[PDB]
């Protein structure tokens, strides 16, 4: 079981952004996960001042996408069926101020052109990560700018890095919660390549695939982690009476209704990793994006199966790679 | 593990409901569940003929409901947001029709009076059912009359039961796919009653807490079965290149927002038990009922936590009773 | 000349329902038959006079992607499924989905109850409710349904009081001023473009005809004159407060399912003209749009009647007409 | 006598962005100021003239409850929250969203950067695609909508070319047909119940007056008329086929968010009555639906002028009236 990382109690009143001279920080984290996949670069920043950052996926060349804005508590801006970058943030709705960054900066890349074609589309979502820390500083335009201008291909800093800074789990009760960070995981089969990046910031605790809570819901009087619901179990026999913000990017084309409706069956798969989710408390969003370049055969069958080789099958493989991302977040 | 019920190879051409003088039976499967909660009747009726049939989920007085139709292949009609049935059915879009079973024997008992308020309003949800047999016997109107009158308080069939006779599971390839069942689980905590009731027909297989494939994508070749996604990886680096129908019922008071959270946070929850879920194939739905008889606390604290007494934790505890629910179905 | 009332009347209690009697389909005949050329799509309208109600079938059996917008507040639907066979519209509340029920039974038989997936036979259906214009508790039973898809013919519609439509009734902030209405349809060729708009309103609200007149629905008869519901309710809170439509619009025009989705959206609130309101909690406004995929449009959009004038935004301008003028048929 | 034309003029390429310029926002003021008494609410426009473009903010600080109809196919929002202390109108298409940063950023600063939940200052914003009605490609930043809030007044809209709507236009068939619109509102006191419709058409559609008069858009300059888009469009066809509105509804009247949520539905397909076609594809037709919970309706519906004459429709169908009235300002 992993040593606790616990956040500590609420310290509201501090500083914000006009307080300070903020000098973006290209994020490197723990360590840097490399991939190949080409087409799609990653740039992270962050404020040390807050600390809170943004995580950028740029795809220059546009790409389809899908939301799954799922979560009842959902800080969202553009949620577009095609996206140029998808930009992640702290700072609840204040840190959708990034994405403005992002899309200015790509404006400008563009030389201001302005048909409708030219349109430069950024996604952006956001965690609330004020209760991890006590400034009240933001991913603001600047940040996201930056963001954009550290993005690189093939690379990911894991743990406390852009968007993951300040993330936490497990808000059953805040002397319980710790902090996460970002993750990202990535496989090739075949021509067939998945991304997924994820910062987990949720109400509930990461799991991993043997059932055991390895993040989130650590009482320091045990030692122990607890899945959330024996708490709530508890609670309501003593009463009654007396967000995560991910992305997964692949390279199969996909029509806008196979699109939509594996980013559906990505999302829902994250509640084997993250428990509870989709809670009326997150504001969970993921974001299903294709570059459409491969195929999948016309017809669905191979050695593993009549049924083994379609949109399905993709989304099946796509969740491990989500759940390995989740993890590595909460490493 | 459980000795496997492979469903065997399809056989289509069999003799539908006008070849035979259909009689209903009152479902009893391989035992019964009792549970205390009043207001609340379950019937179950089946066709021994197909085996087919139907299990309706009566509260008389009307309740409160949210649907989540989350599901690429759902087959739902109504889908009201107050409901005096619920109708859970085989045969695909036809056993939609005892549905109108329900409605026109609800109808009746009303002694035909058909103001506003007084309209019967049932939803129905089916599964498709015809692969796991050699009929094209389907749940009728007679059905679904049948299973209402057939109904009672406090008692729910196991197993092989109403819409659970045929259901099946594990449909990467259907030499592997095996035969599931329906389910329920009850649990009372202080004044807080909660009933799920479950017909798992999944393209994935039931994968119970410890991470173990339970029931589906069982290969007679090996004795073992396999969660989907390692056919389905496999699958695609050979070849690229070379429904599940619920309920949750409770007494707990909810605003229509939160029930509708409520329903979507346990339906996705239910991706730990039955995996992948949510697909493109699936027609999955979900119906979150509420009785409206029991206040959550004002303020959410117990000594359990600060926030440990709410309508999302209501959801993590029902979700633990769905997952009970889905392995009594695969048991 | 201002159109004759047709008030519904009184609401009526304590009418029997449907096995209180032998009842026997009608093919309705309505006041008119529409004729139009567009193979592939069959109509069929059946009532029971003890009621009176009915149903309407609209059957394509190629089948026919679909979308489904369930706009009102009150939607009474089945399946509202994205490809469907046929489209079932009935009276009777959520008691008339039965109707559909019938079809989809009828469909099987005729598919020698085959249930392989291609093979499964995908029936949509809505309701209005339509007790209030009657005193019997009679509704489209599945009985119903079957006839109505077995008096479906190509190139025919019963205008008027006719199967969905028999018992459909307009203007409803007081049941001493609602009107029958009945169903409607209109056809338009364009070339080898076809536009179908089938509906059967049912509304909440009042029909207006295109220079803004009310025309069915809200008839006071203590004045003689129909006026738009507006003038009471603003006079309703003045005093009170001191300090569903069903449709069907049928193209052979190919769309994307996202095309095809906008496109209803835009049909539909484009019957926000005339019918009014419209899309309100008191509705069921559930309109489906379908698409038979005979004709492609170009695939750019240019004309000599402008640079954006050939696309699935302007098809949808051409069927909210088609569309109007089926209102205004219902209402006549 | 036809309104005169004010034709927006052909695309213009190349034009510099916002850092080009020294930008100071100014104060709109349109071509007239609506005064209306609506405490608690504040509106405030401005613009850069070097667009021109420009944003208009609605604030509500005690936080209104909010249902949003982002019925559109090509919507441009941020937020879309259940719950705002503003609503951002903007220019710039997507990045106009900015504008709303400024907004939010403005909010944080008057709450001394406080960031406890209950003090989360939550903006919804959507936008306009303004950019070929001129030849450059500022839009609206975080310092105009900043600027928007600090000139936010009760009580107060100015109408025509102002804050959103400096650079909106309408009929979209062809560019040399389109007209410049404006922004417009309109308010109504019904007793102690007061609705302000707010809105910034930007159609692809023609503002269409209650006569059905295409009074804005679609003017053809080789005619001197407008005519209805439809007409070119079945023109189109029979030739090459051969054989964004953003709007706000705010309201003191009581609604549960499931009445809200219908009501907003109702009002925004109502303005394809003034706006027409309406909810295309080409649209980012986006509709914010406003309650500042100071009044309820009476328990039951009744009055003089019927049985269901008080109720959520009903005052739907009034704002629907007030919203109508607003696009005809803008139009105007």
Redesign the interface.
Known sequence: DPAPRLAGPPV???????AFDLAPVRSTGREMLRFDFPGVSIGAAHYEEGPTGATVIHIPAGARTAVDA?G?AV??????DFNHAICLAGG???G??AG?GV??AL??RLE???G?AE????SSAVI?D?SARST?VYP??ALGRAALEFAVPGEFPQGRAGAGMSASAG????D?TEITGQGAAFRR????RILAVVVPNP??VIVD???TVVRGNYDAQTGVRRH??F???????????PTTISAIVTNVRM????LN??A??V???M??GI???????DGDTLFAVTTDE?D??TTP?????????????????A??VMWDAVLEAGK
Do not use: C
Request: aromatic fraction near 10%; proline fraction near 6%.
């Open positions: 509201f009143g501090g500083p914000g952004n006009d799922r009842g800080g969202l801006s553009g949620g577009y609840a709705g204040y959708l101020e403005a899309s200015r404006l400008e201001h052109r302005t409708f349109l430069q589309l950024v609330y004020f009240a603001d335009k808000k059953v009760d805040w319980r089969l075949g021509d067939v109400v509930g695939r043997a059932g959330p619901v708490d709530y179990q508890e609670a309501f026999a003593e009463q009654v009476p029509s806008p209704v196979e409706q594996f559906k069956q999302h829902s798969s509640h084997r428990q509870p989710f989709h809670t009326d408390m491969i999948l055969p069958g191979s050695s593993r199966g009549r049924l083994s080789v379609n949109a399905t099958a993709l989304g099946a493989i969740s491990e």
